């Protein structure tokens, strides 16, 4: 990510 508002958990990565 390069993005705040995301749609689709497939993209989310641990927070870290």
């Amino acid at each position, epitope marked *: 990510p390069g993005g705040g*508002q995301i*749609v689709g958990g497939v993209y989310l990565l*641990p927070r870290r």
Partner: antibody
Amino acid sequence: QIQLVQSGPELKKPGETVKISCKASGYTFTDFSMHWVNQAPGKGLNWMGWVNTETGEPTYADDFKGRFAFSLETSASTAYLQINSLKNEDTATYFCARFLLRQYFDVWGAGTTVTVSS
Amino acid sequence: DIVMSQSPSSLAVSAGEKVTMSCKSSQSLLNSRTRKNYLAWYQQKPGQSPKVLIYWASTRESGVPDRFTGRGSGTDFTLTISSVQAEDQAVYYCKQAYIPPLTFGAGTKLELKR
């Protein structure tokens, strides 16, 4: 408190255009993606797509690519949904919902129902 | 598109009983890195807009009674209501948000027997 206020019910003739608003309040409008969900009379929920509230970039589900358009007015913390070339089959109630990073809908508007008829 | 299948289509139970709802996806909601299933359950009563109950497949939304419990992982998920009351009469939907477009199940109508 956190709310999504939608415009009233609309009665449009086939082939016309309708534009409904979803005014957010109680939170910073530009921090959460605003999505739209429709429901035909007694038929269940269907995701139409969303509009990024900070970039203003809309994203449509295939089934709504064409006559449907998502827009904003950040200054007014309001989201819009416009349907052009209205079909009788567009009759339904449209909801706007706030989406979270945890991937679910936090708050919803009461929904706006639009009737296509002559 | 990820397909969500919900069943029964509807259920009727007596107050205080435990009811189990099923939802199965086309694919796997489970993100490898986050270790999350992006499956949520929503409750909708007549004329009202939906109201979320569960998100990551299990995590009860704040304000929702522990009576509701979401389980499952992968393609098999369930929603359970341990002590069913009249205020539970509604349609329940599961929604996947793993891979767009977000898709909903057909819903499961829950009524009471008396």
